[PDB]
Structure 1
Amino acid sequence: KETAAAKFERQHMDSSTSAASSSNYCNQMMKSRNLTKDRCKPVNTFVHESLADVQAVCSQKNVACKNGQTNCYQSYSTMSITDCRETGSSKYPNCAYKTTQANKHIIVACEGNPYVPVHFDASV
């Protein structure tokens, strides 16, 4: 059954692009990563870095997660991220997203051994 660590990679990693390059990125990626299968996931972030650099955040700065959990970590560095937010025209199964490209610090929740990212908490 898909592990939380593999789910994190499927929902949030895009190491094969340095940034989104068209306003269609989100529409394409959300669908291809199967995030719109049962319903339109309202918001999702993609990280354009190597997985190794993202797993390493689990050893960077410890911060409370937005929900008060103490297993969150904030990247020491800014990262290339694409934010995808549902549009007013989004209608299941035709989920429609606005693509935003930015460079920010990321916040993830880590668990297990090896200790790796399992949830994308926020970009700051």
Structure 2
Amino acid sequence: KESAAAKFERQHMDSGNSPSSSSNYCNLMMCCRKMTQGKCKPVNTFVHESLADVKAVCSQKKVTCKNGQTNCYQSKSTMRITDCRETGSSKYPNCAYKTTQVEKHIIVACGGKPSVPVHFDASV
């Protein structure tokens, strides 16, 4: 069982000078979206365009994936994204990330029927 004390720290403590700061986006999102469980995911990109714009990439420019697979597609237009990269000081389970906001073309792998994004490959 989680102790009542640890449970209070989880639910009410966030000690620090400016916790609502932009630079904390990846830290909280990586945590919210469950990519800090069991291990820290080193690299993850979030996309801020509509789901419909991202699903459409699966119909755009076909490119080879970094890992040599051939189901990747590059976007025609540049998208608003955020890059979450694990920092130097990061150590499970104190997962820490640098937050980088950029606008770039994305490459996704697509799969299933109907074909939708199943993997973020890179940005250019």
Moved over 2 A (4+): none
* Structure 1 unaligned regions, length at least 5: 1-20
More strand by share: 1
Letter in 2 for 1:68: G
Alignment of 1:1-124 (within 5 A): 22-124=22-124
- Which of 1 and 2 has higher RCO (CA within 8 Å, sep 6+)? 1
Separation of aligned partners in 1, 2:22 and 2:45? 16
Greater C-alpha Rg: 2
Q: CA deviation at 1:105?
A: 0.2
Q: State the 1:111 CA deviation.
A: 0.6
Q: Secondary structure at the match of 2:78?
A: strand
The one-letter amino acid of 1:121's match is: D
Measure, in 1, the Cα distance between the counterparts of 2:71 and 2:87: 32
Q: CA RMSD in A?
A: 0.9
Per-residue CA deviations over 1:65-89 (Å, capped at 9, x if unaligned) read 1111111000000000100111111
Question: What letter matches 1:62 in structure 2?
Answer: K
State the TM-score, normalizing by the size of structure 2: 0.82
* Aligned length, in residue pairs: 104
> Identity, % of aligned pairs?
83
* Structure 2, gaps ≥5 residues long: 1-20
